[PDB]
Paper text:
We determined high-resolution X-ray structures representing the ground states of the two major spectral forms: the glucose complexes of the Blue ttGBP.F17C•Badan and Green ecGBP.W183C•Acrylodan conjugates. In the ecGBP.W183C•Acrylodan glucose complex, the ground-state carbonyl is coplanar with the naphthalene ring and emits a green color when excited, whereas in the ttGBP.F17C•Badan glucose complex it has twisted ~30° out of plane, and emits a blue color upon excitation. The fluorophore carbonyl is coplanar with the naphthalene plane in this complex which exhibits a Green emission spectrum. i The carbonyl hole is formed by K92, E149, and H152 contacts. E149 and H152 are located in the C-terminal domain, whereas K92 lies within the N-terminal domain. The H152 imidazole Nε forms a hydrogen bond with the glucose 6-hydroxyl; the Cδ atom forms a van der Waals contact with the planar carbonyl. K92 and E149 do not contact glucose, but form a salt bridge across the interdomain interface in the closed conformation; the K92 Nζ forms a hydrogen bond with the carbonyl. Instead, the rings point out of the glucose-binding pocket into the solvent and are each wedged inside a narrow channel (“aromatic channel”) formed within the interface between the N- and C-terminal domains. By contrast, the dimethyl amino (DMA) groups of the fluorophores in these two structures point into solution and are isolated from the surrounding protein.
We installed thiol-reactive derivatives of the naphthalene-based fluorophore Prodan into bacterial periplasmic glucose-binding proteins. Glucose is bound at the interface between two domains of ecGBP. The protein adopts two conformations that interconvert via bending of a three-stranded β hinge connecting these domains. Glucose binding stabilizes a closed conformation in which the sugar pyranose ring is sandwiched between two aromatic side-chains and surrounded by an annulus of hydrogen bonds between side-chains and glucose hydroxyls.
Numbering used by the authors: 2 to 306
Write the structure that this text describes.
């Protein structure tokens, strides 16, 4: 049996909960694989100790979802000593870190694509719902719930949703912007604060870097009898799709957990086996990186998910 070690940065991150369950299903389907998977509890020091234990257990490959992307070098040094390949996933290491080890790879996404898709989606629905322009000024007055500062996905999604709207000729006015750390309850608290402050009556659209935060904003809006205010997210979590159906969420963007899990597993198993990382697959590895496309989701294409 081939042991593959996996660390998830935090098991109850909504998106990574989808990913980790999908990786488990891929490993279950492979009778010659034993998956050893750990919750790093959002602490890189815990993750580093977990990696020492996996290496002591003789894993033949590691799939590592970093707590801190800057720790890629620490992880590579541990793996290099045992000649163990590492497939990083979802939290992207630096190019220099990836280039420093011939058996380091990365599976994730092109972060800016999700911001562009989210902006193009907001533009489509704004055009179709001009009653959303509450002050009738032709500009979107928005609030934005940001992910973890410095996370590539949060930074790109925040920058490019606005750039895409503005590039399409839709002026935007930022009424509030703050992190809610990718968390539903923190986002509900932040949105409730904004609905209790002087810009409450001016908010026309809520933009969130992920669905967990969008769902918190949806809850705060319901509590203030403002469910007419549209909310946009990213991930297309199974639970978020239900709100797209009900109209509680105006739109989101599929972050393709099943294919990111599959590519992570396929590459780790090939490397454990001493094969080329993409051998026998159709994964496109570009300079040791696989990026899985995002897809915009709303009521019009909801049935396809
Ligand atoms: C977007 C998810 C993410 O990267 C992230 C990172 C760090 C944290 C930290 C906390 N606390 C210290 C409470 C909460 C959520 C996080 C999400
Ligand atoms: O669901 C898993 C999570 O449970 C929480 O109760 C712990 O505080 C986290 O460290 C852990 O990652
Ligand atoms: O903090 C991220 C996630 O943590 C989980 O424990 C909670 O159930 C989610 O509601 C939350 O979004
Ligand atoms: O100020 C009180 C408010 O705090 C927020 O954190 C909660 O999400 C709301 O439910 C609550 O009404
Ligand atoms: O229905 C959703 C679709 O709407 C289209 O207009 C957008 O261009 C797509 O990105 C999106 O997937
Ligand atoms: O690294 C974890 C993060 O990955 C992606 O950015 C997901 O969109 C987000 O939901 C998740 O919190
Ligand atoms: Ca307006």
């Amino acid at each position: 049996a081939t042991r593959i070690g996996v660390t998830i940065y935090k098991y109850d991150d909504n998106f990574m909960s989808v990913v980790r369950k999908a990786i488990e299903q891929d490993a279950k389907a492979a009778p010659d694989v034993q998956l050893l998977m750990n919750d790093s509890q959002n602490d890189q020091s815990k993750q580093n100790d977990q990696i020492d234990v996996l290496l002591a257990k003789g894993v033949k490959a590691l799939a590592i979802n970093l707590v801190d992307p800057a720790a890629a070098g620490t992880v590579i040094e541990k793996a290099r000593g045992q000649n163990v390949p590492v497939v990083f996933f979802n939290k992207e290491p630096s190019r220099k870190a990836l280039d420093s080890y011939d058996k380091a790879y990365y599976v994730g996404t092109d972060s800016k694509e999700s911001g562009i898709i989210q902006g193009d989606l907001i533009a489509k629905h704004w055009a179709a719902n001009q009653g959303w322009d509450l002050n009738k000024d032709g500009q979107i007055q928005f609030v934005l719930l940001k992910g973890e500062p410095g996370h590539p996905d949060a930074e790109a999604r925040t920058t490019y949703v606005i750039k895409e709207l503005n590039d399409k000729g839709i002026k935007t006015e930022q009424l509030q912007l703050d992190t809610a750390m990718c968390d539903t309850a923190q986002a509900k608290d932040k949105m409730d604060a904004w609905l209790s402050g002087p810009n409450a009556n001016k908010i026309e659209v809520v933009i969130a870097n992920n669905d967990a935060m969008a769902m918190g904003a949806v809850e705060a809006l319901k509590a203030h009898n403002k469910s007419s205010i549209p909310v946009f997210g990213v991930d297309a979590l199974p639970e978020a799709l239900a709100l797209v159906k009900s109209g509680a969420l105006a739109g989101t963007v599929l972050n393709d957990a099943n294919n990111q899990a599959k590519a992570t597993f396929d590459l780790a198993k090939n490397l454990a086996d001493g094969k080329g990382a993409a051998d026998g697959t159709n994964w496109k590895i570009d300079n040791k990186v696989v990026r899985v496309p995002y897809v915009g989701v709303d009521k019009d294409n909801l049935a396809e998910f």
